């Protein structure tokens, strides 16, 4: 409708269309088509179906707009990995569960283009703190 650009980030779910609370005005009020998004985005949300991946946008103007998809929520599959579909009130008094380092291999294998840490161990202990305060324990480790 006019010439105005810049950038705007967001966090629309994976295999799910946006009605009006995710976009509609959100970024629609900038000269950007959602229909041509409910399909473009939710297309690649297929490989990563089941989640809320994070997606940047980029405005030029007119009827122009881009987008870049990232890594989805790994809170989902974990809940599914201890039978619980809703986070813990107190992560340090009442914990959710515990896991193994193996599935931790793929974690850093998708989150790689994000993780800028040093070498392996680097990001091997980064996700620790995350896992740490959500509500889960670290299996195995030093010595033993």
């Amino acid at each position: 409708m006019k010439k105005v650009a810049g950038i705007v980030k967001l966090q629309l779910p994976a295999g799910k269309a946006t009605p009006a609370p995710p976009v509609g005005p959100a970024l629609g009020q900038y000269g950007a088509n959602i229909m041509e998004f409910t399909k473009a985005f939710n297309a690649q949300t297929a490989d990563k179906g089941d989640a809320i991946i994070p997606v940047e946008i980029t405005i030029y103007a007119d009827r122009s707009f881009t987008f870049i998809t990232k890594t989805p929520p790994m809170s989902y599959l974990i809940r599914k990995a201890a039978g619980i579909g809703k986070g813990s009130s107190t992560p340090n008094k009442a914990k959710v569960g515990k896991l193994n380092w193996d599935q931790v291999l793929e974690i850093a294998k998708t989150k790689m283009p994000d993780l800028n840490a040093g070498s392996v161990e680097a990001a091997a202990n980064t996700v620790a703190g995350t896992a740490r305060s959500m509500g889960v324990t670290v299996e195995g480790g030093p010595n033993a």
Binding site: P19, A20, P21, G24, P25, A26, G28, Q29, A32, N33, I34
Partner: peptide, 17 residues
Amino acid sequence: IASASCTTXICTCSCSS
């Protein structure tokens, strides 16, 4: 619970496209 343009989770927001 209602408005135009102005929330994140129920459904209003604002308006255009």
